[PDB]
Each structure stands twice: as structure tokens, then as C-alpha cells.
Write a protein that binds this ligand. Structure first.
Ligand SMILES: Nc1ncnc2c1ncn2[C@@H]1O[C@H](COP(=O)(O)OP(=O)(O)O)[C@@H](O)[C@H]1O
Ligand SMILES: Nc1ncnc2c1ncn2[C@@H]1O[C@H](COP(=O)(O)OP(=O)(O)O)[C@@H](O)[C@H]1O
Ligand SMILES: [Mg+2]
Ligand SMILES: [Mg+2]
Lengths: 445, 113, 445, 91, 22
């Protein structure tokens, strides 16, 4: 008979300490939950004490036992005699925090054992499930426990320590120049100055109307990151096959007309440039492309983890685009699906400590305004994305709407939400002949 | 001389009908720079605002008045805006392209190609 | 009993089929490894066969038996009796690859079960390990199972593989001269130049107001594809019965007046032309028409798959029109229905690697604008169509709205969204007398 | 053949020309989409007492699945509640 | 200049920064 690891002594000590000391409840409150107790009477006692504490009522022996008696739940717990025994047995000079931590650890271990048993039972009786589904199920089961225990890292911090850390960070940024770049280099001077690079562990959202160069801009960023670093760069393309992406990349890097490449009308110099580009790419060998359709966040996260494990770090992750992703459990409501996607992306960004650039799209309502430049509210149906995003960039091109625009070949990257810097608009040159973005050499305002 | 409101509207409609084949607005056989600017501005305004015939005529009259005031005060109209050259000159045959592809395959040793 | 997942018959089939046919070894070797087999004798047999294959020897019955006998391991395998049993029961009608994949699947499930059991055992016996260590151990165990697995077809390939695929595609496109046409030939020079043909795995939308010629243009494209190819061309006519479609097709191909055909007032030359057209069609025999109504995307996909299976592929799929399709589960909301239809059509196009041309309809408000040439925003209530479609063409006939038009007989195909190329207008000549579109011979700007 | 009668929207009477068009079938887009043939009846004397077309009705083909569209004139005898072939000259 | 800026940085680190610091 397997014996699950349960510490009845720790739970009894916690209960006795709470009865004999009501000031420590908060310390217990941040270490254990009601479901963490093995026996049903202990869970019921904790729930009643939580209700009393939230109502302002004392949690002494008489009031707790009486409250259980009034609701008729005293008999299930064990009685006033049992409550008095629990109160009296526990010595006053006890550290409730240690016992609470032991109880907290035991619940995690019990959940792990339950998940292992579920996986084994599912394997023995597949009920038509595939091996891939079982592997995904096991990964999800383990990651659920990991996140269940990955919530203690968030809480209040000391004011003086925060101030000292902020001062140290300011000094360090002014100490190590890097010419204004602290994160992953974007390959553009003005964007680097306004962003200090692409900060690791931050979610980046790129949004625009159709035909604005969103995929083009993302690919230019990816190529710049690959050429200016050594860590691998991963691309998730749910909308294009990898061959078209590579053709676009060849047009951008070799500065050859995309139509010529697509139709094959290339001369000797174009072939030489393409050979040079291929040689550089094969010498570097740090770009990975995944053109699978109907991607799920689990597959994206698993592939990112595998790349980081294989190569010891990821320079940048790119997803195009998140409106094509699916969560099967929440297909009924799109807003819940989007929230789950955003949460999973943020968790992946935190876990791998990498910059993640996810592309998004805007509704037609933006085009109902006289000024079509995007704003934050144009992220309707994706509020969780706007909240969880650490950087938000919108792409705008005036020449798209106006033929006679004076800004032909000029694109605007608008920072609608920046976590660690200022917002503003950056103008760049758009060479659609080469399918590329470049630094703007004209006057800046 | 500058065309009147009716002639300007007729030219704008003709440009709207016949610009579906020209590579760009500057390639249109404009009589003068002022005609190009006025017709293009009216066309873009109509496209972005769905202006009716009367609204188009009013906008044409306003643009003509503004242009006349600008001319009376001087100023020199630059030659459109221009956008890139035409490039060209690709005398490449199939045999040379195939030889280059084979050379690329041999140099990079592509197993799948 | 919790017997581990295994299939002795599949292993026996694999070994016997390898004994009877040695040219299949590669297919077995690419799918199974010696550790995937459950019983020790099967692993030993596969190892000996691998060694024989490596030495360059045949792996038939006698060679394998002699090689085993020389090493004295013939009894461990089971004997020449067991080897002969494997030879006998396995037929020559063997799909060894399917059994190898199945064996692979069983091994994966079994290893998952073993890892789950190990994780549970570790959880029940901490041995002084923290819960963090146990969770790390569980993650490591599941990760080793999932680490790269065997999904190289649906995973992020290396930069080398993607670049090689792109270069091979470039060479294939440059190999056969078609004068800039890579997809299905549309039959019109300017449209071929602007679109490079109808690309496989792409979603193509044709839209216009009623009586503009959507059905006419679609049938003209079908006729051109049938005349300029060899693969079957399938039509899903949810609007008209097939008899009327064939009457229109005869009017288009024979250039005979539609009214004469409809009223039966033909002459000898018209009858001769019709006979010639019928002879050409019966010599070709690659057009299939389905004039059912209210088709769901599932039925369309099933019928297209059946046609491709029976006649070795498809060359074009045509749907007229998507407003007549039905999704019973989503009949309450039209937007969700249109989104599902577009997603299913895109999936079908990508799966069968064929161009799919679907006709759609526009809102009435377009007729209230000063200029009635369609734009993307005119696809109101069908934003998912604009989002998912690879190519969008609008049909515009000026004479429909203006009686005094100078462009009588001239139609415009406006490329509202071209994913892999430029956009603009292509002019064609409309002969409503013969119900046909032809190349525009007038002056071009 | 199934012949179903239908109404149009009132706003049609506020236009300069009151002959029906397809867009005049508001609230009934599916009617326009599904109908094989659509015929509108128009009498000019209903709106104008000065009408030179007294006793003359127009059948306007708004949608024809397998043929042309246009206007056919007939004679209206409201006394007998009848429509008859138009015997006048045809342009 | 830069040297004076870094010197003041170190001075402030000594004056207020403690325990963790940088
Ligand atoms: N008998 C005919 N003679 C000449 N033109 C016709 C005839 N029938 C239809 N057409 C033309 O075909 C065009 C489109 O008809 P059709 O394709 O049936 O409708 P849709 O375009 O809505 O599918 C109309 O603009 C009309 O001018
Ligand atoms: N062959 C081409 N020539 C010129 N411009 C092109 C070509 N192909 C694509 N583009 C431009 O690239 C831009 C971005 O296209 P795309 O990436 O498909 O849309 P999005 O940026 O919304 O994903 C479009 O505005 C289009 O004008
Ligand atoms: Mg895209
Ligand atoms: Mg039709």
C-alpha cells in the first residue's frame, strides 16, 4: 500500500498556532491553501477560519468550534473535544511558517504523483488517443504543477531596496554604453535609441492593417538579429511556407528585386549576390524556420524549449501571426482563447528569457476614422495582449492610403506601449523593390 | 491657362478611368505640372472621402483659387516628385542560368538539390 | 493485469516481410530501431539483419539463418523453426512501413508509461530531495521522451534544409519555360504576368456585384484550365444546374450566340462547331461538374479528395458561390460561418496542392458610393475572407452602371490583394453575345 | 414553377425615379439571392395624374437567371381587373 | 565628464548602496 507523503503534525501545529496566535494568520495565508490539507476535517477547519478572518471575527477555539456547530459541520470535523485537543497539544513557541511550508510542499508532491498515475492509466487504456496527444498531455500536466508552484515569485518589495536597485541599474546603464543598446539589437539606429534594443523576457507585439509590411518588417528584424548576434533565431510562420520566406529574405539581403527572383529573371551579378548571401547564411547557421499551419501554444513553447536546450540560448523568437493560433479547449469564445494565448506567450518569454515578437492584426474599424494611425484601443478583442505586452509597435504607411503622399517609401513605427522607455513615432525608409526597411536619412521631427 | 472647374472635373474623371493601366501617376501624359497636381489631389480626395460630383466641383474650384493665389504671389512648381529609375539590361540566357545553378549546387553541396 | 502496450503480430509481420522482400529494408530501417521491439529475440533478429545489411549480404532466410548459426545465437532467436514461421505467415502483400510505424507508436506509449511510473516512484520516495528536485526530474524524464521525437516533417527545419528546398524550387521553376507562368494558366497574358498563374495551395476569391460576370469568368477560367492542362478540373456549382453550365460552356467555347443556343435557333455551321467542341471535350475528358446545392465544406473536401484519388490529382477547383454553402453548426452567426468556410477552403487548397477559386458577393452599400469599383472594405461581414485569401480579384463592368460608357464590352479585373506580387487593374474584352472574356487588344497605358 | 409575391420598401417612393431596382429589396437579401426570376410591376399613373401612360403597365426584370433583363409593356384594364398584351407600337 | 560621472556614481553607491547594490 503506497503511502502519500502527508504531514499531519505540521497541519495540527499550524492550526494550534493560529488558535493561540491570530497575528500570524497572514504568514500561514501566503504559504498554504485550503486544498493543501489531506484530511477533509482539516480543509473544512481552514475554510471556516478563512471565512472568520475575512469577516473580522476572532479565530479562538470557542468561536471556531461554535461556528462549526452552528452550521452543523462540527460533527464532520471531529467535535469540540477534538478542536480543544488540537489547540492544547500544540505548544505556543512554534514556528508556523516551517510547518506551513512542509504542507505546501506535500501538496505539490501529491499532485505530481496524481499526474503520474493519470498518465500511466491513460497509456494503458488509450481510448483512441494518439501518442502525440499523450505526450502533449504529459507536458501540459507537468507544466500545470510547475506554474502552480511558480506564483510565489510575485509580491510586494521593500521601498529602499527597490530604490537602491533602480539607482544601481541607472548607473550601470550609464556605465556600459553599448551606444544606447541594452537588449537585442534591432539593426536600426533610431529604434535602438528609442528602445535600447529588444529586451529579453519581454513580449513584443507588432500590429498593423493588411499590406503594411508587417511580415516584411518582422523579417527585417529577424535578419538583423541573426546578422548581429550568435544565438539562434527561431521563426514561427503560420501563414506562409518557408520557401516564400526564404525568397523574401534573399530579396532583402541581396538587394535584388523580388519580382525578378520570383520569376527567375536574374543576371550574373544577381546570382553572385545570391550565392554570397547563401554562403553567409551557411557560415552562420543560426536561423530556424517552422511553417506549420494551425500551431498551438504548446507546440510553439516545446519547439522553443528544444532549440534553447540544443543551442544554449535563443536570440529572438518570432510568431506570425497570433490570430491564426488555436486553443482547442476554448474554441467557443475567441476572447478567452486570446487571453490563454497571451498568458502562454508571456510564460514562455519569462521561462526562456528571450525576446518574443508576436504579430497581430487590427479590425476594419480603424479605417472608419479620418486619421487611420493606430491607437491602443484598436486592440479590441485582445485586451489581455495589450496588458501582458511589454512592447507594442504599430506599423503605418501613408502611401498605402494616399497615392499623392509626400512620404512615399516612408513607414512609421509607432510605440503604443513601452514598458521601459518612452513612446513615439519612428520614421524609416521602405524599399518595397528589395522588400526591406532601412534607416531614414531625411529630416526627423 | 488653367482649366475651369468643369474641364478640371472632366480631366479628373478621365484620369480615374484611364489610370488603371499606367505604372504610376507620374507616367500619365500630363499637359503641365499644375494639371498633374490638381487632378491627382482631387482624385485622392475623392478616393479618401467619397466626394460626390458637386463636392468634387467645389474642391476643384477651391484648388484652382489656391493655385491662382500661389501663382500670383510667385513660387516655382517642381517637376512632380519622381520615384526610382526604370533599371533594365538583363541579357541572360537559359544555359548560363542553368550553369550557374549547377555551380551553386556543386559549391554548396546541397543533398536535396 | 497492466500488460505493457505491445503487438507481437506487427513485429512478426515486419520480420517476415523483411525476410521475403529485402528491398524494403530501408523503409523498415527509417521507421523502427532495434530498441523499439519488445521481445528480446526480435531485437536480436533486427540487430543481426542490420549487421548483414551493413556487410553487404542479402538478408533472406538462409543467409540470416547461416549467419546466426555461425555465432551460436540461433537458439536465442527461437530457431530455424521460428524463422520459418516468420517467413511463412507473412504474406507478400505486405505494407511493412505501416507495421513499422505502428511498432514505433507502441514503443513511444510504453516508454511514456515507464517514465510516468518512475516519476511516481521518485515522488513516493524523496530520499532527501526537495520538491523542486522532483519536479526537475519529472520535467527531464518527460523531455527526454519528447526530445525531438520523430516529427521532422512538422518541426522547425535547419536553415540549410529550408535554403536547399528554396533553391530546388527556384531551379524547378526555372527549368520548364512557360514565360513567367508557374501555376495554372489563366489564359490571359496580362493576368498571367500580374499573378504568375494560379498558385497551388492558395485561396483565390473572385468578387463582384450581381450580373457582373462572376460565373462567366469562373467558367472561362475552368475552360482555359481544361484546355491547357491534363489533370481533371472540378466544379462545385451551387447556383446553376449542370445542364445550364454546359450550355454556357458551349456558348463560350464555340463562340455561338447564347440566345440562339437557348432558343434552339441554330444553323449547320453552329451544329458543326458544337460537334467539334463535343469531340474535343470527349477526347480530353477532364472536366467534372457537381451542381448540388447547400454543400458543407466537409462534403466539398470529401468529393475533391475522392476525385483526386480516382483520377490521379486535380488541376483546379471552382466554387460558385460561397454564400450558398452551409455550416449547420454555425447557422446562427454568419460571420463565424464565413470564417469556418474560408478556413476549410484554405486547408483544402493547401492539402490537395491545387488552386481553389471561390466566388463571393458584396454588400449593397457599394452601389451608393460615388465610385463603384470594389475595394477590400466592400467585403463587409466577411473580414475572414479578406484575411485568409491569398488572391482577391474584383470584376468590374462600367457599362452595367453607365449606359453612356466608353468602355462597352470592356471589363476590369482589379487585384485587391496579391500576396506574392504587385496589384493593379487588367483590362479584358467582354463578349456577352458568346458569353466569353478575351484578351484586350486595345491600346494599353 | 413557384411564383411568390413580395413587397418592396417604402423609401423607393422618395426617389426621383421610382422604378424598382434590386437594392430596393431591403430586409430581403436572401430573396434576391435565391430567386430565379424577379419581376416588378410599375404603373406611372399611380404616381402622376398627368401620365401619358394611362392603362399601361411595365414589367421590369430585376434579376433573370437564364436570360436578359429589361422592361415589357402591357395594357392594364382596371375595369375588368385584367392585364392584356400591349397593342401599341414597339420601339 | 565621464570620469567625474563614474566617480559620483561610485560615491553614491558607497553612500546609499548596501547589501545587494550591483
Ligand atoms: N443571354 C445573354 N446575352 C448576353 N449577355 C448575357 C446573357 N445572359 C447573361 N448575360 C450577361 O452575363 C452577366 C453575368 O451573368 P451571370 O454570370 O449569370 O450572373 P453572375 O455574374 O451574378 O453569376 C450579366 O452582366 C449579363 O450582361
Ligand atoms: N512583388 C512585390 N512588389 C512590390 N511590393 C510588394 C510585393 N510583394 C509584396 N509587396 C508589399 O509587401 C507589403 C506587405 O505584404 P504582406 O506581408 O503580404 O502583408 P502583411 O504585411 O500585412 O503581412 C504589401 O504592402 C505589399 O505592397
Ligand atoms: Mg501575412
Ligand atoms: Mg451567377
Amino acid at each position: 500500500l503506497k503511502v502519500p507523503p502527508h504531514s499531519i503534525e505540521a497541519e495540527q501545529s499550524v492550526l494550534g498556532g493560529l488558535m493561540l496566535d491570530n497575528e500570524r494568520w497572514d504568514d500561514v495565508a501566503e504559504r498554504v491553501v485550503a486544498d493543501d490539507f489531506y484530511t477533509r476535517p482539516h480543509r473544512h477547519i481552514f475554510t471556516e477560519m478563512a471565512r472568520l478572518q475575512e469577516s473580522g471575527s476572532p479565530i479562538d477555539l470557542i468561536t471556531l468550534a461554535e461556528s462549526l456547530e452552528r452550521q452543523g459541520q462540527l460533527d464532520s470535523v471531529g467535535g469540540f473535544a477534538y478542536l480543544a485537543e488540537l489547540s492544547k497539544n500544540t505548544p505556543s513557541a512554534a514556528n508556523i511558517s516551517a510547518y506551513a511550508d512542509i504542507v505546501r510542499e506535500r501538496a505539490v508532491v501529491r499532485e505530481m504523483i496524481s499526474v503520474a498515475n493519470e498518465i500511466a492509466e491513460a497509456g494503458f487504456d488509450p481510448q483512441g488517443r494518439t501518442s502525440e496527444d499523450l505526450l502533449d498531455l504529459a507536458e501540459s500536466r507537468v507544466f500545470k504543477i510547475a506554474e502552480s508552484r511558480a506564483n510565489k515569485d510575485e509580491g510586494p518589495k521593500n521601498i529602499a531596496d527597490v530604490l537602491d536597485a533602480t539607482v544601481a541599474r541607472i548607473e550601470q546603464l550609464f556605465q556600459q554604453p553599448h551606444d544606447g543598446v541594452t537588449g537585442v539589437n534591432t539593426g536600426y539606429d533610431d529604434l535602438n535609441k528609442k528602445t535600447a534594443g529588444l529586451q529579453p523576457s519581454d513580449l513584443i507585439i507588432v500590429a498593423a492593417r493588411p499590406s503594411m509590411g508587417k511580415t516584411t518588417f518582422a523579417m527585417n528584424l529577424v535578419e538583423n538579429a541573426a546578422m548581429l548576434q550568435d544565438k539562434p533565431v527561431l521563426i514561427f510562420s503560420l501563414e506562409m511556407p518557408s520557401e516564400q520566406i526564404m525568397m523574401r529574405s534573399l530579396a532583402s539581403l541581396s538587394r535584388v528585386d523580388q519580382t525578378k527572383i520570383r520569376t527567375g529573371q536574374l543576371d550574373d551579378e544577381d546570382w553572385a549576390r545570391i550565392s554570397g548571401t547563401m554562403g553567409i547564411l551557411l557560415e552562420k547557421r543560426n536561423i530556424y524556420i517552422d511553417d506549420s499551419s494551425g500551431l498551438t501554444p504548446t507546440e510553439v513553447r516545446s519547439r522553443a524549449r528544444r532549440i534553447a536546450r540544443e543551442h544554449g540560448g535563443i536570440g529572438l523568437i518570432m510568431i506570425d501571426y497570433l490570430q491564426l493560433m488555436r486553443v482547442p479547449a476554448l474554441s467557443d469564445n475567441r476572447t478567452l482563447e486570446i487571453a490563454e494565448i497571451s498568458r502562454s506567450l508571456k510564460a514562455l518569454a519569462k521561462e526562456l528569457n528571450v525576446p518574443v515578437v508576436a504579430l497581430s492584426q487590427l479590425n476594419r474599424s480603424l479605417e472608419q476614422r479620418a486619421d487611420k494611425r493606430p491607437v491602443n484601443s484598436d486592440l479590441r478583442e485582445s485586451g489581455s495582449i495589450e496588458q501582458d505586452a511589454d512592447l507594442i509597435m504599430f506599423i503605418y504607411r501613408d502611401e498605402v492610403y494616399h497615392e499623392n503622399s509626400d512620404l512615399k517609401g516612408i513607414a512609421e513605427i509607432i510605440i503604443g506601449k513601452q514598458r521601459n522607455g518612452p513612446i513615439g513615432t519612428v520614421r524609416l525608409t521602405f524599399n518595397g523593390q528589395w522588400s526591406r526597411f532601412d534607416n531614414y536619412a531625411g529630416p526627423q521631427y | 491657362g488653367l482649366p475651369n472647374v468643369s474641364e478640371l472635373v472632366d480631366m479628373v474623371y478621365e484620369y480615374c478611368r484611364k489610370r488603371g493601366l499606367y505604372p504610376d501617376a507620374e507616367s500619365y501624359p500630363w499637359k503641365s505640372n499644375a494639371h498633374y497636381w490638381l487632378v491627382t489631389n482631387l482624385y485622392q480626395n475623392m478616393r479618401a472621402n467619397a466626394l460626390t460630383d458637386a463636392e468634387l466641383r467645389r474642391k476643384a474650384a477651391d484648388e484652382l483659387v489656391h493655385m491662382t493665389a500661389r501663382i500670383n504671389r510667385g513660387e516655382a512648381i517642381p517637376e512632380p516628385v519622381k520615384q526610382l529609375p526604370v533599371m533594365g539590361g538583363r541579357p541572360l540566357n537559359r544555359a548560363q542560368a542553368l550553369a550557374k545553378i549547377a555551380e551553386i549546387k556543386a559549391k554548396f553541396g546541397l543533398k536535396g538539390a
